[PDB]
């Protein structure tokens, strides 16, 4: 054993109480298999890049290009349903870009145009920005022409020195007259003798005024949010109370993700009772083996078998020929053997250890099966992935990794199908991939017949 509690043959079939070791020599150490549990799946390059993409064929996707498109990078394929339009209905199986995808989920149009000086555009925009629904092409009037060419409502941001009126509670505490006592009315200087309304023009910073300390004198945007702004929603209990109540009750989710009616996102501004309700709805958008794993599970091969049977003998030679090739794969799958949800990978079998040696050489040199540098690749990526998800998750970086991860999963399986991995500067040599082991210039079945 490792520690030595049991050391001979009499008890050959039992395991040690404090440490686990059942024995017959180290051959067990070269025959046993371990596995890595992948964060978010990836797929076998052996099934994705063979001339006939066995998954592109079975899953009617662009046999060769739609795959490469969503697999390695972020090109999303709407998996189940996505009510909101592009111009046309939800594309059951079609794929879209980051850009247009972006335009969807947050809200139609994003326009942040922030004014140059403090008094010219800051006034044009402000007057028409807070409660006024700004129609498309709203020609803001000062630097050049601030053009807001899109939809529903508007949200402006900062304000320096010109005149303060109707703005949020920021400046309220600054000039103590209104937040300390009810003096905002007298704040209007001299004509009061003959909601926000401040002095003629006394403050010029984005600060806190204990002593002008916590400050930030800068710019002032006028970002137009294309979304519909509700101020006084009411209670109707047919379906669960949607949106909000007058002022007391607010059943909506906070200001990220909330689906009420056909419109599906809800931002919240506790300033005035304003429940910002964006319109894009639940659009299942996925990319990577995640998406394909789904698609693959959902298919009832029997149906596509029968569907192809009809497509095969009936229409003309162009689409029926494609269907005959696509019927081949689906048939065997069903025929005898195993079912097709397995082509996706989420559990990587690891090759034995003594088969990927770590050995002492000369002086103290060591020698290890190239396979091990590839395994570490994957393990590190898989780990870093986990920790990246847990720490918090900025989209770009999660995919970025997921990508590396994928590539890695290729590496051990087969190197070179997509780029070729290298041991660090010394040998620009393809680390022998498991594949390279089986086939290779002088691989396994191969030298299995050259001689022994």
């Amino acid at each position: 054993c490792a520690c030595g509690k049991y050391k001979r043959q009499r008890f050959e079939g039992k395991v040690c109480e404090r440490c686990g070791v059942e024995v017959t020599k180290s051959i067990v150490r070269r025959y046993r298999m371990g596995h890595i549990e992948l964060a978010t799946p990836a797929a076998h390059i052996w099934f994705v890049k063979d001339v006939p993409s066995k998954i592109g064929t079975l899953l009617d996707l662009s046999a060769t290009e739609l795959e490469q498109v969503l697999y390695f990078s972020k090109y999303i394929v709407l998996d189940p349903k996505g009510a909101i339009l592009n111009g046309v209905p939800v594309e059951k199986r079609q794929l879209l870009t980051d850009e247009e995808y972006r335009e969807l989920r947050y809200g139609k149009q994003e326009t942040y145009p922030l004014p140059p000086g403090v008094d010219a555009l800051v006034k044009d925009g402000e007057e028409v920005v807070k409660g006024q629904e700004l129609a498309p092409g709203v020609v803001s009037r000062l630097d050049g022409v601030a053009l807001y060419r899109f939809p529903r409502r508007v949200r402006v941001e900062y304000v320096k020195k010109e005149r303060a009126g109707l703005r949020l509670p920021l400046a309220a505490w600054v000039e103590k007259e209104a937040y300390k006592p009810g003096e905002i009315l007298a704040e209007l200087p001299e004509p009061y003798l003959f909601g926000d309304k401040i002095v003629a023009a006394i403050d010029p910073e984005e600060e806190v005024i204990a002593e002008a300390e916590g400050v930030v004198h800068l710019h002032e945007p006028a970002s137009i949010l294309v979304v519909k702004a509700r101020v006084y929603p009411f209670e109707d209990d047919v379906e669960v109370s949607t949106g909000d109540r007058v002022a007391p009750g607010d059943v909506l989710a906070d200001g990220g993700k909330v689906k009420s009616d056909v419109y599906g996102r809800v931002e919240v501004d506790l300033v005035r009772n304003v429940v910002r309700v964006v319109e894009s709805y639940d659009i299942d958008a996925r990319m990577g083996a995640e998406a394909i794993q789904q698609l693959l599970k959902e298919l009832d091969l029997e149906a596509l078998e029968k569907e192809l049977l009809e497509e095969m003998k009936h229409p003309s030679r162009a689409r029926r020929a494609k269907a005959r090739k696509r019927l081949e794969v689906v048939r065997a799958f069903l025929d005898s053997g195993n079912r097709p949800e397995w082509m996706i990978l989420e559990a990587v079998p690891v090759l034995p250890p003594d088969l990927r040696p770590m050995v002492q050489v000369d002086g103290g040199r060591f020698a290890t099966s190239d396979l091990n540098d590839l395994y570490r690749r994957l393990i590190n990526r898989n780990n870093r992935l986990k920790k990246l998800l847990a720490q918090g998750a900025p989209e770009i970086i999660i995919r970025n990794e997921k990508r590396m991860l994928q590539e890695a999963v290729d590496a051990l399986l087969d190197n070179g199908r997509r780029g070729a991995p290298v041991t660090n500067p010394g040998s620009d040599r393809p680390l022998r991939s498991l594949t390279d082991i089986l086939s290779g210039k002088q691989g396994r079945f191969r030298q299995n017949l050259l001689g022994k």
């Binding site: 020698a367 540098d373 918090g392 998750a393 660090n424 022998r432």
Partner: protein
């Protein structure tokens, strides 16, 4: 197609559409992140729920549905029912504490937002720690993990901005990674700097001798406790391994690992050994008293290598008595019928 360009484009495009303004935007997000913290804790205080739990429920509602909770973290939080229960009590928090809920989420957003914006910062940094033995994307990614770390500790009360703050928290993360993953045979950070020092020193030494320094110079130039045994050792660990599979001789088809023999495996000669040895050792073990012979047979050949602790109840005198008298009658009759003499070893 090719992996670097795509991500470069990927975040450079997003920074291109959203860089953070020097003061305002970074100030803004910062303020929100902190308020979130103060919020989540105050939530913990009034719900009796761990800040860890309050942090994960707000994350789910702002960053991702049941999909992101089920695959990443296996399953302890019921995909639907669990998180939701938690959101309900958050709602119930009247006007006063509901405010914190609404703040927590928005703060959470800011976080991820600030994190997005300063990804150029990482890449610019990570760019220079390139040839250390880590993949550019791996390097940017650790550095990324580093910027996220900075986000947790930055105090906006202390005027300095996130730029100079992220730099450190990122450079730390990178260097660590470089020292932790770069090699197959792990080597702690100290050995690492040690090796850099060793290298650097060897450089200054190559400068004038015209003689690649004998390990004498390196010891000297290095400092306090450096000797020849130390340097020969360090550079022996510095050599990365070799591809057990490498093209050898005329690289036509020579893979290095066929030439290394095997040691545990009993080459035929040994299997034959163990047979006679065990059969004859077993014959002698029987024709003898199953007393002090088995004691020393089991004490030596069955467990571990204790005269006193060797025999059951009978003390030392009977041990040495039968050990040495049976061991010799056994050897001297084995001297007669010479079977063992020819040293099986």
């Amino acid at each position: 197609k090719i992996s670097t360009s795509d991500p470069v484009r990927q975040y450079l495009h997003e920074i291109g559409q959203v860089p953070l303004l020097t003061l305002e935007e970074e100030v803004e997000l910062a303020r929100k992140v902190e308020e979130g913290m103060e919020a989540i804790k105050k939530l913990s205080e009034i719900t009796g729920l761990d800040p860890d739990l309050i942090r994960e429920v707000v994350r789910a509602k702002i960053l991702g549905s049941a999909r992101v909770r089920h695959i990443p973290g296996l399953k302890e939080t019921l995909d639907p029912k669990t998180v939701e229960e938690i959101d309900q009590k958050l709602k119930s928090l009247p006007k006063e504490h509901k405010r914190y809920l609404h703040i927590a989420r928005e703060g959470e957003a800011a976080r991820q937002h600030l994190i997005e914006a300063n990804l150029r910062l990482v890449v610019s940094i990570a760019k220079k720690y390139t040839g250390r033995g880590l993949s550019f994307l791996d390097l940017i990614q650790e550095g990324n993990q580093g910027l996220i770390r900075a986000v947790e500790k930055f105090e906006y009360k202390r005027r300095f901005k996130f730029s100079t703050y992220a730099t450190w928290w990122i450079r730390q993360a990178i260097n660590r990674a470089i020292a932790d993953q770069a090699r197959t045979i792990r080597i702690p950070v100290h050995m690492v700097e040690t090796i850099n020092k060793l290298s650097r020193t060897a450089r200054q030494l190559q400068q004038e001798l015209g003689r690649e320094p004998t390990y004498e110079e390196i010891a000297e130039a290095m400092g306090p406790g450096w000797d020849a045994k130390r340097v020969e050792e360090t550079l022996k660990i510095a050599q990365e391994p070799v591809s057990l599979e490498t093209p050898i001789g005329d690289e036509k088809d020579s893979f290095y690992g066929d030439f290394i023999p095997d040691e545990h495996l009993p080459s035929p000669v040994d299997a034959a050994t163990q047979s006679l040895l065990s059969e004859e050792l077993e014959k002698a073990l029987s024709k003898l008293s199953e007393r002090e012979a088995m004691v020393l047979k089991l004490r030596k050949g069955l467990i571990d290598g204790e005269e006193v602790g060797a025999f059951f109840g009978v003390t030392r005198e009977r041990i040495r008595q039968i050990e040495n008298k049976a061991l010799r009658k056994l050897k001297y009759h084995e001297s007669r019928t010479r079977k063992l003499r020819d040293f099986l070893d």
